[PDB]
Design a protein around this motif. Structure first.
Motif, mmCIF file in Angstrom:
data_model
loop_
_atom_site.group_PDB
_atom_site.id
_atom_site.type_symbol
_atom_site.label_atom_id
_atom_site.label_comp_id
_atom_site.label_asym_id
_atom_site.label_seq_id
_atom_site.Cartn_x
_atom_site.Cartn_y
_atom_site.Cartn_z
ATOM 1 N N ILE B 7 -28.817 54.000 -44.991
ATOM 2 C CA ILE B 7 -27.488 53.956 -44.387
ATOM 3 C C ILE B 7 -26.634 52.989 -45.196
ATOM 4 O O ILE B 7 -27.105 51.898 -45.566
ATOM 5 N N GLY B 8 -25.404 53.380 -45.474
ATOM 6 C CA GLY B 8 -24.520 52.541 -46.273
ATOM 7 C C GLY B 8 -24.486 52.784 -47.762
ATOM 8 O O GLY B 8 -23.511 52.380 -48.429
ATOM 9 N N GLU B 9 -25.521 53.439 -48.285
ATOM 10 C CA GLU B 9 -25.564 53.866 -49.690
ATOM 11 C C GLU B 9 -24.797 55.169 -49.869
ATOM 12 O O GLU B 9 -24.765 56.025 -48.965
ATOM 13 N N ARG B 10 -24.190 55.341 -51.036
ATOM 14 C CA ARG B 10 -23.578 56.629 -51.346
ATOM 15 C C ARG B 10 -24.675 57.698 -51.372
ATOM 16 O O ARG B 10 -25.802 57.420 -51.785
ATOM 17 N N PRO B 26 -22.503 64.195 -53.542
ATOM 18 C CA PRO B 26 -21.652 64.513 -52.366
ATOM 19 C C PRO B 26 -20.244 65.029 -52.735
ATOM 20 O O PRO B 26 -19.462 65.419 -51.864
ATOM 21 N N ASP B 27 -19.972 65.032 -54.038
ATOM 22 C CA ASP B 27 -18.661 65.342 -54.626
ATOM 23 C C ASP B 27 -17.993 66.603 -54.102
ATOM 24 O O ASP B 27 -16.769 66.632 -53.898
ATOM 25 N N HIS B 28 -18.781 67.648 -53.900
ATOM 26 C CA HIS B 28 -18.267 68.920 -53.428
ATOM 27 C C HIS B 28 -17.466 68.751 -52.136
ATOM 28 O O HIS B 28 -16.389 69.334 -51.991
ATOM 29 N N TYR B 29 -17.988 67.951 -51.205
ATOM 30 C CA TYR B 29 -17.321 67.738 -49.921
ATOM 31 C C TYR B 29 -16.312 66.575 -49.977
ATOM 32 O O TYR B 29 -15.229 66.667 -49.388
ATOM 33 N N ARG B 133 -16.296 59.715 -47.772
ATOM 34 C CA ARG B 133 -16.401 58.885 -48.970
ATOM 35 C C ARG B 133 -17.736 59.083 -49.665
ATOM 36 O O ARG B 133 -17.977 58.496 -50.705
ATOM 37 N N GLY B 134 -18.631 59.879 -49.062
ATOM 38 C CA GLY B 134 -19.928 60.171 -49.662
ATOM 39 C C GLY B 134 -21.029 59.247 -49.200
ATOM 40 O O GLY B 134 -22.117 59.265 -49.765
ATOM 41 N N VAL B 135 -20.762 58.442 -48.157
ATOM 42 C CA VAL B 135 -21.674 57.366 -47.760
ATOM 43 C C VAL B 135 -22.574 57.848 -46.610
ATOM 44 O O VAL B 135 -22.085 58.465 -45.663
#
Lengths: 243, 243, 244, 243, 243, 244, 243, 243
Positions: B7-10, B26-29, B133-135
């Motif tokens: 939790i908290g990591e990209r 996670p870039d796609h979203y 943010r991808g996190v």
């Protein structure tokens, strides 16, 4: 990233210091034929954590009737645990009856993978469901900012217990699954001959050879599970803050 | 033990093959301003997994309303994914609209810690909630034998999004918390001076300087979250096996 | 590069999960006195792979009468294998009678060096011919885009079996070798004295001391081998897609 | 217990000494726009190897027709290569026109994984099919005691060039496949969208969305490939040992 | 920049393949009480190598009389060894009676330090003289382009055996040494007391206490040694190319 | 179990202390266009070594005419080398005119692999023939108990010089080879086309495509090489102990 | 055994969380021209630790006028720090004015060597006196069971400051040393010439060349230092538990 | 940084040379039933060290009363030790009765961590208080420029012995603690049940359940401790310098 124990593994063997005394995990509970839910919170004297201990305290009797004990965990000392439980009893009027592990130094925290990137210092809100053989069955990791839904934990344990005793797998959202309701699933065949025979037998309700089910759970067990969910969906008529 | 993102990591940056095409996570979203819930199941053409895909598919408009996409994952090929989707549509009458990652070889599975002691070959039922943010915000690990409660996943995302937009923490069992009901919690003060300036302001409902709260959530936010719980608690009008 | 078991090695000992159950290789077959051909395919529900499973199934009786079992392998699960076999039986009308290993994770693929640069994720089309002593006798690696010639695999096992039983080596293109036809070769002498004595024996046809041969295979054995090649060469009068 | 190069990999760059002189692989062929078949044999003046060299030399024109060169390999010196060639020409009456690599010390053998457990000193009968980009397309490993079927190697190269030029996959036993005869396969869709679109298009004969095929190859290419198998199956009219 | 066994070391223990069969060295010869000369050549069917095999073969009776067996070595296979011998017997009219080790892969060559900078692939012209205890007594390394003088190898073995027998050292150029002719050397005293006592004994011809000698070799042994040199020096009466 | 430089390698670069002074090898000779023969002996004041020194000194002019320098080597000091040379001159009446490397500590010996199992302390009788390009051409290792045949070392140097200048290989026992006598050998073809070309060329005497020879060495060159062997074979007329 | 920072070393650079906010050490204090005393205690809501905090608080203005600040440290969280300070203020009537570092995880503890064999989980009672250059000047390690004598810490800081400023060393038990009283020591000569010269000058009271002293401290400085010791020795006239 | 032994650890077992003979530590004192205070100083014939030896010497009977032995330590040799002692007796008139360790080479120093950044060559002023079971109880590290308060060391020993015998912790500044005076503290409860039973007993003076105390020390124990502090605070009647 970081290391965690895994579902299907024996819960890590460890002596822990709680505000009730020193106990050995999982032995202390295995030796009584009990399951346990070990859960963590970041720190005593925090508001979401307070709400959760009160939620677990309200449900204690439901866990007890399943044969499930509760044990909390945070990096605070036993003295803070005891002061905090006093505060809760004095201000909320709710006595927390179960132990909390004091893990200053974070030795237990590291072993269970409870330190995440959200805080270098304080555990997130992990939950480990451990059966009477001492085996980890389910693991949840909630963040600092969001309290758990304690009735889901009761649903997990009850469903695992039923699946264990009835030799059945548990569908999504049981006992209200949208395809089979309170039905439970026969573990699928893993050979061609076994698949064919399950078809020929005609024993079960069947969507395909790999998707058979029946309704072996007693009405009391279904009613008990659905009760946890009804309570979760219901708003309290009397909020504790009021008095 | 095994190793997991935290939790908290990209979310671990990776290119994955899905039955909708190859995409970068996670870039796609992230690039669409979307949260996503990535979940795994052990194998296509297994029955608890099929109940869960149907549950998610049925609840898909509810995820879409919140700005959250769904992406599944198993070690099966894209061909099996498409065949399985075809089967559920033909036999249960539900179309599965969201992609599934194909991870033969377990490359993704290992990066996400989805291979537990229960099976050397197939992932357990993991869930990773990932913000715009991808996190990574929450992670759940359910076992082979037990389906997820999907309305809890909806309640977790709704509550995190609400907490983020209102700068609030969310109490246990929200919106039905037994102390503060649908009240939301002010993150506690972390300095003496901050703690006293909060007590002086008179600005919040207050059980102590570290437990302040207020009710900033709209009725629409509160009632949508409670509706997920109500739905979880309610017996299906008609079972999909029937038709 | 990557690593592979080698001709002349005992097949890597391993417990594998098949759609027929869990078996031990190569013991399961060695214990029955059977050869086996293990072959791999990238993924179930793929079209070249379907044509090769049909081809193996159509030759299944030929393999059996040689005392050779078949076992396939892909990274798909057992559930996918069964569903796939159902599809082939329903749509092609061909029942696939032999087991397919499920190897999600590639633990077997890796041990047998079946993951090439063509794909991260899915095995190529490898074939391992393994004798009743558990020993690898031949390995072929075909690529994703090109199906195998199944009749060559029956020729390889027949010829290896014949060679073993008759203490002979097998010429290229046998039983239609351009030099010696259905002749089989005596393994060449490896010492000077042995060479000398083989020539004084006058026991065999002989091109040089290192190239002697005779014709110890029965008409039936030879004809069986020719039949595999005649089938390979023959266009089917009726194609399965026709009544599919 | 041995390492080999792999399908899809560029052929290992090496300078090799042949009985035609030194050349660089794969460049010598790539720069001519040519495919090559590199094949090995245990030792010159061995009988199975001799039969195989004669089969390759008889088919030499068929290889040339396809833009394919042949290159042999064993651990023997160039002197023995030339002497063996002289013997085969004088006693069989067959001139061997292509080069043989001399690999004493087994440096090349080692790099191609040609030393197997069956001998420690002589290579087995390996075959590397290598396209005009220098890339490895197929590899076969026959043992000491069994000669190859050279017609299959012709069919492999032919079929590979055909699939390359027509963007198709080639079924088992092609051009005599028992399902689609001399039909060639369209590589399957890898997304649901692509799958639905192919089905609706009516472009191909279709057993299912993942099994589409057509007949794009010329009668000439089909009959050429079938001829290789027909030859393999014909009993020779006159045996070379006779004359 | 290469590794060799050493004078006074036991010859490396190894099983080798010869065109006479597999044997173990040095054991095979030790167990018969025989010395052996192991010598190497770059490749079968090479001209300097052919002249040296014919020279060895010519002196086979001389070596045998000294209790010395001969064994050749190259990286060629047994099949080439045998064809090369057939060639030599057919075209030169000399049967080579001794074994040749087939070392494809260079395993023996490497152990014996026979691969020098000249080649890469083929051994130099090494010579190991090995006594009946399996001990290396002398080593010569001649290059590709220069054949050996085989009569010096006979002189070497002859002198070593005689020195061993008579407990004498052998002067330069023996039996034709310029200082002492066919005299042999008493190994020098290694202490002052042993030196004085030899001086006082009057027992030997003496240039100094460290240079004493006598003439202990039989006339037959001396004449055998001079004959090897006479043959070396003598112009052949009719060459074998004349036939 | 010892390391040696190898034929075809440049002789290990090194400064060495001789009884003629310090020199850098092989540069000191390469710079003069000279070949050299470096040989070793176990110890000064030992009898076989003394016989070999006298043999070299007697052939010194033979080496000088070939353009070959000589340099010795043992573990003894320069002081010992000088006293030993004085002793030989005084008691045998032969002046040793070439340098000896003093290598106490075996630094040079280790580099040249001259320390064998026979003695942990003293070098065997090694010989290194090194050409005008500093390249090692031949290496001989004789033991303590056996002196060298100095005439074969002269035959080696002569034959290598002739091979190099005539672009020929030298048969066994040259110039008295039993097959071709004083003939020299054309290095064999290494391609098929080169083979066929040479055999159709009628250019050389020829036993086979790989065994071609001719007779390009001069009478004087051949007679010189024969003379070394003739000297090796001849019972000496006057022994040097007789007048010592 | 364990590792500690050393006298004469710069205090370890570290960012630390206190109940006054996050600060960097030693920079936060160096920036202000201040010495600091960092001290640790085992846990909040412990009795000996509470008595020390009250003693330091009582002496806080004494430290301030010396230009010294105080900073405590325990493994408890900041929430516990603030609750415990509220308790002290409410019950004992003393407000604790200085920050306490919260070190859950023992990160600071392990850098300072504060975890000794007496407890695996809680720090002992360490004290680091650090000057305005960030340099550690003195370190004390008291155990769980014994509170510090806080007046000695004031005596240490005063004496060090005076010694640095007057360029003098400070006798035992200063300002009441039995040999020289409130006298201060000239650092001893380190060469023979300096020793002679020191003797020659007749500049100082002298017992030996290595033991010279004088009385440079002001009456006020001596009186302030003696006042700390007088306070230590005096029984308080009223005890705080009384009210 | 540096490495130190730790409170609660057995003093490192070592043989050491002192000016009274070779002894093994802590055995030499443990086997006497004696506590000891091992202390260090930079070098013999240095002035601050001289004041401190004099201070310990004069307090010697006070350490003896407690059953505490003293042992010094510096890198100087025993000859310098005996000479320095003679100088102090002749010149100051004080006999130093206790042994000093000679540690040239710094063997002992490193093992005790007495070599700090202030000097590469000479110990700091370390103090180890070690009880009769050989356990380290407290450690102090003073620097070169600052003499110890020897009366604090006596107070630490007395209070630790008193605590040990009464099962009590000793508050800050005892016996003059500003909250509780000469009272001693009952170690706090570590479980909730114990904390409740303590409150129910009404056995102690009680500020809270974790802060109970009583007055079990004898007047002799209190007044002896207070005397050390009175002595520390008192201006000497006559300075030893005057002579």
């Amino acid at each position: 990233p970081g290391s965690i124990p895994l579902i299907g593994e024996r819960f890590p063997e460890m002596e822990v210091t709680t505000d009730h005394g020193v106990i050995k995990l999982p032995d202390h509970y295995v030796s009584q034929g009990k399951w346990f839910v070990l859960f963590s919170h970041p720190a005593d004297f925090t508001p979401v954590s307070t709400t959760e201990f009160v939620s677990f305290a309200r449900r204690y009797e439901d866990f007890q009737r399943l044969g499930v004990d509760l044990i909390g965990l945070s990096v605070d000392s036993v003295f803070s645990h005891i002061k905090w439980k006093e505060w809760i009893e004095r201000h909320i009027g709710v006595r927390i009856p179960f132990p909390i592990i004091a893990d200053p130094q974070g030795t237990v925290a590291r072993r269970l993978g409870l330190l995440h990137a959200e805080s270098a210092t304080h555990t997130v809100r992990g939950v480990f469901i451990v059966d009477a053989r001492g085996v980890i069955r389910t693991m949840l990791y909630y963040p600092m900012e969001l309290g758990r839904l304690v009735d889901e934990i009761l649903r997990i344990v009850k469903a695992l217990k039923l699946g264990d005793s009835l030799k059945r797998a548990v569908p999504a959202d049981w006992p209200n699954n949208e395809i089979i309701g309170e039905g439970l699933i026969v573990p699928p065949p893993t050979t061609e001959d076994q698949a064919r025979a399950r078809m020929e037998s005609g024993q079960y309700r069947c969507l395909d050879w790999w998707f058979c089910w029946d309704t072996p759970a007693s009405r009391d067990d279904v009613e008990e599970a659905r009760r946890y969910l009804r309570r979760a969906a219901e708003k309290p008529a009397k909020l504790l803050y009021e008095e």
